[PDB]
């Protein structure tokens, strides 16, 4: 089908210099993709044309976001709602209930030898499990979707911009997109990078923040990602939510999601769903916390997939100079647009 | 203690007219200092009596050269050998491992305002770091030296001749001194003057060669400088080496340095050390290439601190007339004296 309208470019000397300083140890390298220069991992290229042209189905539900914005929460909510609050069945791994469309791009099979070198103890891994993970990461995302039979509802996870996917997809599919204060996404993302060993242990959050707001982290530029989803926010098949609202009004956001998915929830059902997403409960939920991975040996001490679950904790990481920089960056990107974060 | 025995003179209308045509744009002016007429940036005067009288220490090691003769290599070899080949600890910046005795002199704080005018793009300066550099450059060398505590070994870099430093210093301290073919020193120096923006964009190598062999560039007259180190060549505490030898027999030179500093390196330790001074490897060594300065905004496009790393390349810059002129100049300073270069 349709030709892939995008070129890619390597990073120039300065961009390369910066990324290499913070993510250099990590074997997978980046490429800037399309006219907005979205950072993708190089393995993304083999499947770029396939995702653009992926066959979609009227029962597909997508959960989208720049990473670390509230995907996991939403996924759980959306899945339970569509599955008639069947909690019992929701106990299987998220990873097995959703397809992670663009999760594949992080691993380059040409460099299999290199990824355990990033771990403190390569000699502790569970190799049956770890090699299974590497094999799964090898299958492009488009194949995983396609694999799913038409009598099974597809639940899709993705951190992809809309312009890397079929345009007019919202003609066919429903999507919930999450956004979140960039400054908090920066901190969450920094830690997540620490979690998987994506970042050089000698780098610090400032460094990360540089890479981030300047548009040289995974799937940035940040505001372009969000701006795409914001511009389709009134489409009956699109639902634009802020992480912060989950904290302010969890009952209220649930009711919105059910309304979106064409479902009636009774006050109590929403309440039961509200208790379910309680941070401490969720955090110690085996089905959603990827603590299955820790057993494998690929998660760092200290870090966790479900971390603190608060809004505004960026003030704890940003210094005076950093705080001004962020204010000018958010100021410039919200100039001449109606996008507002309810927090600020 | 001890009065500074040297007088200083302004340049005459002649000398001035020439210097002025080649380096006029650069704020700092020169003075000829002492009976041999060493060119020194005016700001050198305020510290000259102090360097001449500076307290010295048994464990002090000095690396000395007329600039662009192989200081940087020598510093790295000496540093590593002294620190029991701890290649890790040497990953800090050379600037922080050595104190550049006379580095201060190129900046006159009275003309702070004038130094960013010489840049193509002053508006892209990193002010914090650039003002940081200016400030550091205002500290007399003698003071930086004095501040190193007695139980830290003092590594000194300098381009001063011996007569401007304590007489009899070689009773107390070791010095490695590097000499190099003047014609190559001229070319490296021309490019170096280009790197920092010292030289007028409209001047060329010929104009520069005029200044240099005539005794009207930084720290010339060239031959008087070398001759000084050469007469102390047999002193137990002086090690006179030629740049050309580092290319001819690097292992051989590393062994000589090693022995000078009092170490018995094994064949292999010398190998490890030579691989380390591999030109491409050195050039890309963040700790010695000064490319950290490029992000500040103070180096020129085109130029690099570690450039070509080759002997005999002056034949590419000298014309017929310049070559002969040079043949005559070199012969005249080597008349009645046992100083010979390996190259010629
Ligand atoms: N039930 C919940 N309630 C509130 N926040 C949750 C949550 N489950 C996960 N989170 C948080 O959402 C962020 C991850 O979002 P995503 O799923 O898009 O990666 C993590 O943020 P923090 O790192 O800021 O704590 C995490 O702690
Ligand atoms: N590892 C190395 N091997 C050979 N030459 C080196 C080197 N590191 C620096 N140099 C060279 O030594 C010269 C500078 O000397 P100094 O360190 O005293 O400034 C420069 O010469 P060229 O400009 O001729 O290339 C430079 O390229
Ligand atoms: C939103 C982010 C999530 C859930 C990220 C996790 C991603 C995965 C599956 C990472 C996996 C890896 C795997 C499976 C193997 C080697 C390295 C690496 C750490 C890149
Ligand atoms: C052998 C020469 C070396 C390594 C020279 C480096 C010199 C320095 C410290 C140069 C710095 C400058 C600084 C810091 C500021 C304004 C102008 C100027 C170019 C004179
Ligand atoms: C601003 C409270 Hg985390
Ligand atoms: C002798 C030519 Hg570099
Ligand atoms: Ca390995
Ligand atoms: Ca100015």
From TrEMBL, chains A, B:
Keyword annotations from UniProtKB, A to Z: Calcium, Metal-binding, Transferase
Molecular function as annotated in GO: metal ion binding; sulfotransferase activity
Residues reported in the UniProt entry to bind Ca(2+) 1: 113, 116-117
Q: Which residues form the Sulfotransferase domain?
A: 58-337
Entry superkingdom:
Eukaryota
Which family is this sequence assigned to?
A: Belongs to the sulfotransferase 1 family.
The organism's taxonomic lineage, starting at the top: Eukaryota, Metazoa, Ecdysozoa, Arthropoda, Hexapoda
Residue span of the signal peptide, if any? Answer: none
Q: Which SUPFAM superfamilies match?
A: P-loop containing nucleoside triphosphate hydrolases (SSF52540)
InterPro entries linked:
P-loop_NTPase, Sulfotransferase_dom
Output this protein's name. Retinol dehydratase
């Amino acid at each position: 089908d349709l030709p892939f309208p995008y070129e890619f470019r390597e990073l120039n000397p300065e961009e390369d210099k910066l990324v290499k300083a913070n993510l250099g140890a990590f074997p997978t390298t980046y490429v800037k993709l399309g006219p907005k220069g979205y950072m993708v991992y190089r393995p993304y290229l083999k499947d770029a044309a396939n995702i653009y042209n992926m066959p979609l189905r009227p029962t597909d539900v997508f959960v989208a976001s720049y990473q670390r914005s509230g995907t996991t929460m939403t996924q759980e909510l959306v899945w339970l709602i569509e599955n008639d609050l069947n909690f019992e069945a929701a106990k299987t791994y998220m990873s097995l209930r959703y397809i992670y469309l663009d999760g594949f791009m992080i691993y380059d099979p040409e460099k299999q030898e290199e990824y355990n070198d990033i771990l403190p103890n390569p000699e502790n891994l569970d190799m049956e499990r770890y090699l299974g993970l590497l094999e799964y990461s090898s299958r492009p995302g488009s194949s995983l979707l396609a694999a799913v039979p038409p009598t099974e509802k597809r639940f899709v996870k993705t951190h992809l911009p809309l312009s890397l996917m079929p345009p007019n997809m919202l003609d066919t599919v429903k999507m919930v997109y999450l956004a979140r204060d960039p400054r908090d996404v920066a901190v969450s993302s920094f830690h997540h990078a620490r979690l998987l060993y994506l970042l050089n242990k000698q780098s610090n959050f400032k460094d990360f923040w540089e890479m981030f707001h300047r548009g040289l982290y995974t799937l940035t530029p940040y505001f372009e990602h969000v701006k795409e989803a914001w511009a389709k926010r009134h489409d009956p098949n699109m639902l634009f939510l802020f992480y912060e609202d989950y904290l302010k009004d969890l009952p209220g956001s649930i009711a919105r999601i059910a309304d979106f998915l064409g479902k009636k929830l009774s006050e109590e059902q929403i309440q039961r769903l509200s208790e379910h997403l309680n941070f401490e409960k969720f955090k110690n939920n085996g089905a959603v916390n990827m603590e299955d991975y820790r057993e494998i040996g690929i998660l760092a001490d200290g870090e966790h997939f479900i971390r603190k679950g608060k809004a505004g904790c960026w003030r704890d990481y940003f210094d005076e100079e950093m705080t001004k920089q962020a204010e000018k960056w958010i100021k410039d990107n919200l100039k001449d647009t109606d996008l507002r974060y309810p927090n600020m």
